[PDB]
Scaffold this active site. Structure first.
Site, PDB file in Angstrom:
ATOM      1  N   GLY I  30     -13.805   5.244  34.031  1.00 29.12           N
ATOM      2  CA  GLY I  30     -13.302   5.222  35.622  1.00 29.12           C
ATOM      3  C   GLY I  30     -12.487   6.315  35.902  1.00 29.12           C
ATOM      4  O   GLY I  30     -11.908   7.277  35.405  1.00 29.12           O
ATOM      5  N   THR I  31     -12.226   6.366  37.434  1.00 26.69           N
ATOM      6  CA  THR I  31     -11.224   7.299  38.096  1.00 26.69           C
ATOM      7  C   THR I  31     -10.038   7.156  37.617  1.00 26.69           C
ATOM      8  O   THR I  31      -9.409   6.217  37.033  1.00 26.69           O
ATOM      9  CB  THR I  31     -11.629   7.105  39.637  1.00 26.69           C
ATOM     10  N   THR I  32      -9.008   8.159  37.798  1.00 27.81           N
ATOM     11  CA  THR I  32      -7.700   8.229  37.515  1.00 27.81           C
ATOM     12  C   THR I  32      -6.694   7.579  38.577  1.00 27.81           C
ATOM     13  O   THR I  32      -6.925   8.073  39.554  1.00 27.81           O
ATOM     14  CB  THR I  32      -7.160   9.793  36.867  1.00 27.81           C
ATOM     15  N   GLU I  47      -7.415   8.806  42.651  1.00 28.60           N
ATOM     16  CA  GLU I  47      -8.381   9.811  42.990  1.00 28.60           C
ATOM     17  C   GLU I  47      -9.695   9.297  43.312  1.00 28.60           C
ATOM     18  O   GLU I  47     -10.292   8.175  42.888  1.00 28.60           O
ATOM     19  CB  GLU I  47      -8.745  10.658  41.435  1.00 28.60           C
ATOM     20  N   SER I  75      -8.583   1.032  37.729  1.00 30.39           N
ATOM     21  CA  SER I  75      -9.502   1.938  37.417  1.00 30.39           C
ATOM     22  C   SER I  75     -10.662   1.433  36.519  1.00 30.39           C
ATOM     23  O   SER I  75     -10.260   0.434  35.650  1.00 30.39           O
ATOM     24  CB  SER I  75      -8.727   3.147  36.532  1.00 30.39           C
TER      25      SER I  75
END
Lengths: 233, 242, 241, 250, 243, 244, 198, 111, 244
Positions: I30-32, I47, I75
């Site tokens: 996943g996204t940070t 993010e 995330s």
């Protein structure tokens, strides 16, 4: 790999994937194309309906949810019926209890959560359908993309179904033009029809092939079929 | 083994696709829609000469304005018809009017999804999909004469003409050529008989085939064996002409 | 509770649990029914693997559902009792609400509905039973004979057989049953029923039981000797050729 | 959530064996030896207290348990399974008997209730059988003294004397040599200690051995006076000191 | 030859592999604890390890205050540890409400051991991957240590130890109680009993400790409490001025 | 989820047989043989205790012959614990009947009920069947002395003489050979013992390895009597018939 | 209320039941048959609350017929009465009790004895030589105490019912519109069709 | 004791012409001898050329109207935007009322 | 043998739960997202990968509020995060209903912990496909927490998860060293923007959108509030100046 981890929605793959959800996603790709787009005054759905034979009718893909909200579907139509019914009830509940038209953003959150419960429990299955929700609420025109993974995304324009990438690249180029189409419903629908035609290949847009829907500032959600959409071919 | 409501990698539900195979093994049923009425015909297909053929009931009434023909696992059709009848009568009780054919079909198709082993959202106690397809034909004031094909997938297409069962692919191609918007009821009756005769293993007579129709005036009627026998005689004479 | 989908579709479109229930019927002892003009006769066979039974108390293969309707079967004996009990309950329920006994078609339709339900309910297997249901509708002299099977399909027959070697006896009935002129008497209707079983049974008056049902709740079972007279008289006609 | 295991985990194999019952019996075989011996005027039940560490206090774990004032139990196999069987056995003696008839159940009937509980863990959905064999010794007015064995299947049998667990085959053989129908309680205690001494490797004393009797009524253990009919429990656990007395003259 | 190792049913040898693998999980945290009884107190020591510099050290704990009188140290993963902790607290409070007196250490242990036995016999519940050591100064039994495991086993201890290097602590303590001839630490103040525990953990493990390398829980008459880093530092200063 | 660990105890084989019923029947064929024989003036129930010891208390033991009613008893072959579950429900059913109609329950009605319970575990619920076969011995004023048998399938049948458990094929041949319709209880007592004596897997047939019962008219009363033989009485009847 | 009388003589039980059905100020029917055949040799008469009376009788009838088919055997009059008593006893502690009183006249083919059972709405069963429900007993019992003999023929029984009905027609305030009389004996159940002017 | 009913007074009047119909009602709303409002409309346009008033206890009147309006909404959703004929509305309202047969809507309704 | 990673509640032979470990892979994919504890509050940032120009900027909000004083960010599988927060909100309401006071962050952390742990106890559910960073201000100060799919959670000075967690953690560790006496809310907001930008080098192939929220006693009155307008740009400008 895959073979062993795709038997049910309750199982993660070794790389953290959910294959049953991904297979449900594949039902949408096999589904017939439909496009959504909006400006600041209106939001438009355009759909390519599919038939079985030349003797059969064309499967309707647009469903009205309330006077200010509705959606188009690609994938399992029975699942769209269930999800649209839920949305109809949520819209209705908001009006009856709070005398408040449901925010399109909140409608997106509710669909997400309803789809999510099917991806974490045993025995169930994910929904096998994708939805494009349009609406006009207290913050203007809105377009949403719903995937049965639970992910819901607010966009200016988009498409789903087979060959939907063609329409999506068109809209991604046309962005600055169609977003400025304020106070002119016909011109937004033209831009939607030019987008849906980007995904064509098999055939041309005929009179009982095309289905269009529109909602906006002084426009209740209304569906157009047949001779009513003849002026856009 | 594997869940009954599992998706294939291609995006189809295994149990629904497999049920579609069971319907292909079923007896042929044909519907023809016209502006004078809708005709429903079926192949009886008795498994022995000792079978009393008039006890084979693959065409049933749902209401005076709605009729039904079935193909596949016909025992599975009983609860669907019981539901359909109750829906149509219930609608009449709540609204003092006839149910629309499309709404009746939708109600029947709402049953088809409800299978699993304790799925999320609602309680659907059914171990498998239905192994039978229905041809629902009728009339209402808004959309006139209508023919629908209800599948165990839960989708229902409207048709000007439709064949289901074993001889369906061949029968449908025959219906593709023969149907036109200004057919009379008489022509449709003979056209059902003609196509049934083509795809049936046995020779078509008034005992191994059955006809029916629905009209605005007289409602849904199953034709008795004497009436159909005349139509078989009439069809034979036209084919011999040219 | 337990709700496993035991009856499901396979890739070729068959429901193997229903079809395997039919194999249970095939193993079951033969049962036959033939309609006369004024009667219906139900014939069944009895095994001879084990002998030393008390026939007074051992459950017979022909069961009364009501005074005017009877039910025989082939397949699992234990499974048949559940259907018979439910049939009998529904018979009294019908008399209570409609103020008229069940038609033979309706009783058959009910039993067939029960069987069908056990093919798409969770946590249960189908009945390993096919039934022959026979009798006369109230105030009616037209004889009725129906057959059900594990799928829930049912239909009426001029004559029919089920169980082991039912292929043979059906073949016999298909050549020996005339529709334009059915067995006009109770006597010659029974004879045809016995003749059909003798293709499969192979010696036995105690290996054959026969019930005769007539209009207005006139039902009776035959004794060993009564049947033995039919068996003896049939064998003597063969030798004179 | 939801015990979705609503199906049996014990089923018949092609040979007719009920696998989990056999495997439970195998678990009992690995368990420490316990025994029981019925005399004319009492019953004795005994077992080894095999401590899992010298830092543990083996007084805090009793393998020999009171179920009713006149009934006691000991086991071989899995201890935690035994503990919960005792809780349930004590409770069922009240709910299914004492609260109805106002007296404690006779031994055979309490054994019957325990056996039923064990049978159900052999057939009910989503459980395994109990991995223990119990020996239940008791007294009641109309049946006198009795000793019963209860197995993971739920089967139970009355015994004059027996053993279960590790060295049960040898122990039974030794009991068959020494048992008769004219034994006094003290003679049975002695036979029990001799038998148990063949099973124990290490130290054999009142701290490593656990032993209880069903015998005479103990008015000193009742807790009150005034009612002539209430004469106290027949179950008594022997102390560490009381065992050592009988080992010095062994 | 497979599924008998996935749920809690007997293997052909009469074993429960999922129980045995749950014991394995208890050592995942690589932390050692021990417990000793004083004259009128009970002390638990557990190693405290904070690898990540981004952690708030004050939240990294495997000791729990179950009730006013009972304390519990867990050897095993923290999610399961807190599951056991929350249940024990609820059980402790319910006991007091229904029966009118504080739940004894040994009774709570039996109860939690019974719950564990259930997961060992019912298929749908997994064992918890933890060993729970309960401590108190019981109003009837005095200083008390009772320890439960994923098999549903429990017993009282004179002293005990748990973790990867359990055996080193155990034999060290065994050798002390052979010399001293008694079944407790003969010392009036709890502070010196804490010093004993830490001293014997140092000897057994062959490792020195700072104030942040240890967690300490103490039970006295009518209260169980945990020491702060500064309370521990005071304790580590005492042992150094003598070693 | 759970689906993986489900044996599916209630399904057909491709041959149309119930796996678990067949495998339960296999289990019962290793159980001690039990025999029932009906005479004109009573019924005999004889059963073999498989696996015994010197220390097994026979006086107190009861593992094969159980009383359901003053007029009905059963002989058990299979899992004893399973049988006792079924015994107890049968006892309650007989009492419910008596409370409802103020008449003792007819034997068949009791047998049908109990066999229907067995059939249930065969068709729904996902549980293993009861590993038990019963011989029922009873009397009522409609059919007099009756003998019935039920097995794990839930099928029941009526008999003049029958065996369950081990070596039923051999036992049933021997019974079919020496049985006749006009027999007397005392003759049946002998037949049952002789038959067990020939089919036994043990060296000899001693008193300590048997259970024995009669349901007789009581000789001098007018109503039925249930006699469950004590060890000494079996030791006596074993000498009379000539097997010391 | 409705008249319900019963009498067991030597070889039969005779049941007499009034024909009137009255609601408020109007007699709605004067030919009502307040009885159901439960089996070929067992007859039950009933009186009490409007709807409950027939609903109960038909429910009992359905149950006894079900038993007969299942067992291929007729239950004794004693067994049928005990079943009826138990059903009534259940309902008295239920949400809405059956307010129905019954007489059960039966011929026990095993004993060759007629049998009459009186059961009230509470489940109070009792076996009698003669019985009545409601107020009618207040006249008939004393009349029957005097004139009844246990060895009476069926014909002497009918004469004795006539005496009871005449007394009720004289002294009871209600016009109950005569009675329907039925005889239960070894040959089953028959109705005395000419009691109006016998 | 709590009385779940009240009386908000007012009066309504419906007359049907040959090609028209009127439904009228005063706008006064009262409790006992006090006025709650001089203008509180109780006659409503429910869609599909149907006007409706449910007069008596206003809280039951509003609830009924509200439910009927919702019924019209769903009738469109479930039957392809079909017009709800006046006879169909009437039968629908019968079931809405009779549904609360044992705890009635305390109103006289006219459409 | 094998097959230990097919069901959720199953222990492997080395004491692990592979289905939870596989859920971690969903988070790592996943996204940070991050959290930063300042000296009177907490800051959250994430993010948002801009897949296309068609995504409406500033809509599609990812950070969620619980009660009025707690922020959550996560995330991995976004729907699983929402599900968790819905539970959190139900749970916080319950606490307030009974105890009047707003739920303390430690209390709230355990409520999420116990719920997430529960989804590792049975094979009829799958673990959560998110790691959630959350916290806020209560009676006694600010609190920051991170909660993994196992249900494991601890208090943090700074937290990071998702694709770029190593970069973020490295930057977070530098701030802990170089600001030992404590960071301010104003600073932490700017510093969080920097870390999301430095962490975005892992997802540098596609464009992204920054989102920040904060809960501070002096800056927001202890309420959770989103960072918008001039303060958000100031943080973006700071990150862009630091990147070069």
């Amino acid at each position: 790999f895959r073979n062993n981890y795709d038997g049910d929605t309750v199982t993660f793959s070794p790389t953290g994937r959910l294959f049953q959800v991904e297979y449900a996603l594949e039902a949408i790709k096999q589904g017939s194309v439909t496009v959504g787009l909006r400006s600041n005054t209106h939001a438009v759905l355009v759909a390519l309906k599919r038939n079985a034979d030349e003797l059969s009718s064309y499967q309707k893909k647009i469903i009205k949810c309330d006077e200010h909200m509705g959606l188009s579907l690609a994938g399992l139509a029975p699942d769209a019926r269930v999800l649209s019914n839920y949305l109809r009830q949520q819209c209705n509940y908001s009006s009856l209890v709070f005398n408040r038209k449901l925010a399109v953003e909140r409608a997106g959150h509710l669909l997400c959560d309803k789809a999510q419960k099917n991806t974490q429990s045993y025995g169930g299955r994910p929904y096998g359908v994708g939805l494009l929700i349009i609406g006009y609420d207290k913050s203007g025109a809105h377009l949403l993309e719903f995937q049965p993974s639970g992910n819901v995304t607010e966009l200016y324009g988009t498409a789903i179904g087979a060959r939907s990438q063609g329409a999506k690249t068109y809209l991604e180029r046309t962005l600055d033009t169609f977003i400025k189409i304020d106070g002119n419903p016909d011109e937004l629908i033209k831009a939607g029809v030019e987008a849906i035609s980007q995904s064509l290949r098999d055939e041309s847009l005929t009179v009982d092939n095309l289905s269009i829907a529109i909602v906006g500032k002084d426009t209740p959600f209304t569906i157009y079929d047949g001779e009513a959409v003849a002026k856009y071919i | 083994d594997r869940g009954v409501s599992t998706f294939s990698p291609e995006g189809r539900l295994f149990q629904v696709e497999y049920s579609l195979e069971a319907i292909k093994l079923g007896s042929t049923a044909i519907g023809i829609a016209t502006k004078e009425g809708v005709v429903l015909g079926v192949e009886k297909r008795a498994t022995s000469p000792l079978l009393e053929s008039d006890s084979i009931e693959k065409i049933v009434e749902i209401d005076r304005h709605i009729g039904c023909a079935m193909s596949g696992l016909t025992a599975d059709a009983r609860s669907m018809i019981e539901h359909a009848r109750t829906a149509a009568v219930t609608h009449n009780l709540y609204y003092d009017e006839d149910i629309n054919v499309e709404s009746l079909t939708q109600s029947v198709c709402d049953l088809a999804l409800r299978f699993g082993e304790g799925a999320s959202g609602e309680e659907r106690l059914m171990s498998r999909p239905f192994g039978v397809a229905l041809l629902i034909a009728g009339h209402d004031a808004d959309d006139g004469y209508q023919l629908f094909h209800a599948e165990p997938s839960g989708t229902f297409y409207r048709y000007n003409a439709k064949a289901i069962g074993s001889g369906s692919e061949g029968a449908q191609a025959e219906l593709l050529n023969e149907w036109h918007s200004s057919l009379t009821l008489k022509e449709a009756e003979l056209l059902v008989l003609k196509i049934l005769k083509q795809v049936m293993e046995e020779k078509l007579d008034e005992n191994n085939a059955q006809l029916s129709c629905i009209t605005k005036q007289d409602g849904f009627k199953i034709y008795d064996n004497e009436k159909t026998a005349e139509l078989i005689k009439e069809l034979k004479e036209k084919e011999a002409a040219e | 509770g337990y709700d496993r989908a035991l009856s499901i579709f396979s890739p070729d479109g068959h429901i193997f649990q229903v079809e395997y229930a039919l194999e249970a019927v095939k193993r079951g002892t033969c049962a036959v029914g033939v309609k006369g003009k004024n009667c219906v006769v139900l014939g069944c066979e009895r095994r001879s693997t084990l002998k030393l039974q008390d026939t007074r108390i051992t459950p017979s293969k022909v069961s009364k559902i009501d005074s005017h309707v009877v039910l025989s079967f082939s397949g699992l004996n234990a499974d048949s009792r559940i259907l018979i009990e439910k049939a009998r309950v529904e018979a009294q329920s019908h008399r209570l609400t409609l103020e008229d006994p069940v038609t033979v078609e309706y009783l058959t339709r009910y039993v067939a509905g029960v069987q069908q339900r056990y093919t798409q309910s969770g946590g249960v297997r189908p009945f390993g039973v096919s039934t022959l249901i026979a009798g006369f509708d109230p105030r009616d002299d037209e004889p009725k004979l129906y057959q059900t099977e594990p799928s829930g399909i049912y239909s009426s027959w001029s004559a029919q057989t089920i169980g082991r070697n039912s292929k043979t006896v059906r073949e016999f009935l298909e050549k020996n049953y005339d529709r334009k002129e059915p067995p006009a008497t109770v006597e010659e209707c029974v004879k045809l029923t016995v003749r059909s079983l003798l293709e499969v049974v192979q010696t036995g008056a105690k290996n054959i039981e026969i019930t005769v049902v007539k209009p207005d709740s006139d039902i009776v079972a035959l004794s060993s000797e009564e049947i033995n007279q039919y068996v003896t008289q049939i064998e003597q006609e063969k030798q004179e050729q | 959530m939801t015990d979705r295991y609503s199906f049996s985990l014990t089923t018949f194999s092609p040979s007719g064996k009920l696998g989990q019952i056999d495997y439970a019996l195998t678990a009992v075989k690995q368990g420490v030896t316990s025994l029981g011996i019925k005399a004319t005027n009492g019953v004795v039940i005994a077992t080894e207290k095999k401590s899992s560490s010298p830092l543990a206090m083996s007084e805090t774990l009793s393998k020999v348990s009171l179920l009713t004032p006149d009934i006691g139990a000991v086991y071989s196999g899995m201890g935690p399974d035994y503990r919960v069987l005792v809780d349930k056995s004590r409770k069922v003696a009240h709910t299914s008997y004492k609260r109805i008839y106002g007296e404690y159940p006779p031994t055979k009937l309490l054994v019957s209730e325990v056996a039923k509980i064990m049978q159900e863990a052999t057939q009910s959905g989503g459980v395994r059988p109990f991995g223990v064999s119990l020996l239940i010794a008791g007294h009641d007015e109309f049946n006198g003294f009795s000793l019963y064995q209860v197995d993971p299947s739920g089967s139970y049998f009355p015994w004059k004397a027996t053993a279960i667990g590790k060295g049960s085959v040898a122990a039974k053989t030794f009991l068959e040599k020494r048992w008769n129908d004219e034994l006094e309680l003290e003679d049975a205690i002695h036979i029990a200690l001799l038998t148990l001494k063949e099973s124990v490797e290490g130290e054999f004393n009142g701290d490593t051995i656990e032993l209880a009797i069903i015998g005479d009524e103990n008015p000193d253990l009742l807790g009150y006076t005034g009612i002539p009919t209430d004469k106290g429990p027949r179950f008594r656990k022997l102390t560490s000191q009381e065992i050592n007395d009988r080992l010095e003259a062994l | 030859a497979g599924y008998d190792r996935h749920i809690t049913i007997f293997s052909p040898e009469g074993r429960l592999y999922q129980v045995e693998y749950a014991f394995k999980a208890t050592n995942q945290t690589n932390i050692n604890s021990l417990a000793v009884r004083g004259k009128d107190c009970t002390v638990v020591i557990s190693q405290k390890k904070v690898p990540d510099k981004l952690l708030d050290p004050t939240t990294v704990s495997y000791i729990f205050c179950i009730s006013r009188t009972i304390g519990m140290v867990v050897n095993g993963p923290i999610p399961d540890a807190r599951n056991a902790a929350l249940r024990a607290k609820a059980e402790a409070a319910e006991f007091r409400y229904k029966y009118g007196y504080d739940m004894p250490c040994d009774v709570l242990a039996k109860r939690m051991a019974n719950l564990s036995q259930i997961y060992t016999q019912r298929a749908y519940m997994r064992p918890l991957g933890v060993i729970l050591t309960f401590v108190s100064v019981d109003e009837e039994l005095g200083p008390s240590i009772y320890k439960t495991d994923p098999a549903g086993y429990y017993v009282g201890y004179k002293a005990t130890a748990t973790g990867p290097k359990q055996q080193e602590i155990t034999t060290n303590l065994e050798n002390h109680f052979k010399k001293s001839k008694i079944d407790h630490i003969n010392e009036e103040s709890w502070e010196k009993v804490v010093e004993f525990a830490i001293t014997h953990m140092i000897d057994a493990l062959g490792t020195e400790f700072s104030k942040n390398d240890l967690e300490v829980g103490v039970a006295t008459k009518d209260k169980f409490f945990t020491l702060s880093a500064e309370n521990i530092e005071e304790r580590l200063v005492a042992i150094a001025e003598q070693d | 989820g759970s689906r993986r660990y489900d044996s599916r105890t209630t399904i057909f084989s491709p041959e149309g047989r119930l796996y678990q019923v067949e495998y339960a029947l296999e289990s019962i064929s290793h159980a001690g043989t039990a025999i029932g024989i009906m005479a004109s003036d009573g019924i005999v129930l004889a059963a073999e205790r498989k696996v015994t010891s010197t220390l097994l208390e026979q006086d107190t033991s009861t593992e094969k012959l159980y009383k359901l009613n003053d007029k009905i008893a059963v002989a058990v072959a299979g899992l004893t614990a399973d049988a006792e579950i079924l015994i107890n429900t049968a006892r309650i059913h007989a009492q419910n009947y008596l409370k409802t109609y103020n008449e003792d329950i007819p034997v068949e009605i009791l047998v049908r009920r109990l066999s229907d319970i067995k059939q249930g575990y065969t068709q729904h619920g996902g549980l293993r069947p009861f590993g038990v076969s019963f011989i029922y011995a009873g009397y009522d004023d409609r059919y007099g002395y009756q003998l019935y048998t039920s097995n794990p399938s839930g099928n029941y049948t009526g008999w003049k003489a029958i065996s369950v458990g081990a070596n039923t094929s051999a036992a049933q041949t021997l019974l079919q050979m020496d049985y006749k319709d006009d027999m007397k209880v005392d003759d049946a007592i002998e037949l049952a013992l002789k038959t067990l004596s020939k089919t036994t897997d043990s060296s000899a047939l001693t008193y300590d390895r048997l259970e024995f019962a009669t349901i007789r008219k009581g000789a001098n009363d007018g109503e039925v009597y249930q006699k469950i033989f004590k060890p000494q009485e079996i030791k006596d009847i074993l000498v009379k018939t000539g097997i010391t | 209320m409705d008249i319900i009388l019963g009498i067991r003589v030597q070889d039969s039980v005779i049941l007499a039941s009034s024909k009137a059905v009255t609601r408020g100020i109007s007699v709605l029917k004067d030919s009502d048959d307040k009885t159901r055949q439960l089996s070929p040799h067992t007859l039950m008469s009933f009186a009490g609350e409007a709807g409950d009376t027939v609903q109960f009788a038909e429910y009992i009838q359905a149950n006894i017929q079900l038993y007969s088919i299942r067992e291929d055997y007729e239950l004794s009059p004693q067994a049928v009465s005990s079943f009826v008593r138990q059903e009534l006893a259940k309902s008295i502690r239920s949400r809405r009790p059956y307010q129905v009183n019954v007489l059960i006249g039966g011929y026990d083919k095993k004993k060759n004895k007629p049998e009459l059972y009186q059961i009230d709405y509470l489940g109070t069963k009792v076996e009698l030589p003669y019985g009545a429900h409601g107020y009618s007993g207040f006249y008939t019992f004393s009349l029957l105490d005097h004139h009844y003999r246990p060895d009476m023929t069926t014909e002497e029984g009918l004469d004795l019912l006539k005496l009871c009905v005449q007394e009720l027609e004289k002294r009871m305030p209600m016009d109950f519109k005569g009675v329907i009389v039925k005889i239960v004996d070894k040959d089953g159940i028959r109705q005395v069709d000419d009691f109006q002017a016998q | 004791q709590f009385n779940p009913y009240g009386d908000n007074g007012g009066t309504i009047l419906g007359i049907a012409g040959e090609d028209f119909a009127v439904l009228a009602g005063d706008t006064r709303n009262i409790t006992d001898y006090s006025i709650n409002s001089r203008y509180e409309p109780k006659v409503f346009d429910c869609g599909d050329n149907i006007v409706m008033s449910a007069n008596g206890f206003a809280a039951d009147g509003d609830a009924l109207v509200k439910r009927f309006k919702n019924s019209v909404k769903w009738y469109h959703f479930d039957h392809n935007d079909k017009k709800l004929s006046i006879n169909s509305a009437a039968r629908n309202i019968q079931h809405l009322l009779y549904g609360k047969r044992f705890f009635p809507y305390y109103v006289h309704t006219i459409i | 043998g094998t097959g230990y990673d097919l069901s959720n509640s199953v222990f492997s032979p080395d004491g692990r739960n592979f289905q939870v470990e596989y859920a971690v892979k969903a988070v790592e994919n996943g996204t940070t997202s991050i959290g930063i504890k300042c000296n009177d509050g907490v800051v959250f940032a994430v993010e948002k990968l801009i897949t296309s120009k068609l995504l409406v900027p500033q809509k599609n909000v990812k950070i969620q509020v619980v009660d009025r004083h707690i922020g959550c960010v996560y995330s991995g599988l976004i729907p699983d995060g929402r599900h968790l927060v819905n539970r959190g909100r139900e749970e916080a309401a319950s606490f307030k209903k009974l105890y009047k006071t707003p739920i303390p962050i430690p209390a709230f952390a355990d409520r999420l912990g116990q719920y997430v742990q529960a989804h590792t106890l049975y094979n009829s559910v799958r673990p959560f496909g998110v790691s959630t960073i959350f916290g806020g201000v209560d009676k006694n100060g600010a609190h920051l927490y991170m909660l993994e799919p196992s249900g494991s959670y601890w208090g943090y000075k700074g937290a990071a998860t998702g694709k770029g967690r190593q970069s973020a953690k490295a930057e977070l560790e530098k701030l802990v060293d170089h600001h030992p006496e404590g960071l301010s809310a104003r600073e932490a907001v700017k510093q969080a923007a920097k870390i999301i930008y430095l962490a975005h080098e892992d997802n540098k192939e596609k464009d992204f959108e920054l989102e920040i929220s904060w809960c501070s006693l002096s800056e927001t009155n202890g309420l959770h509030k989103f960072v918008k307008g001039d303060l958000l740009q100031e943080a973006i400008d700071f990150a862009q100046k630091e990147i070069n």
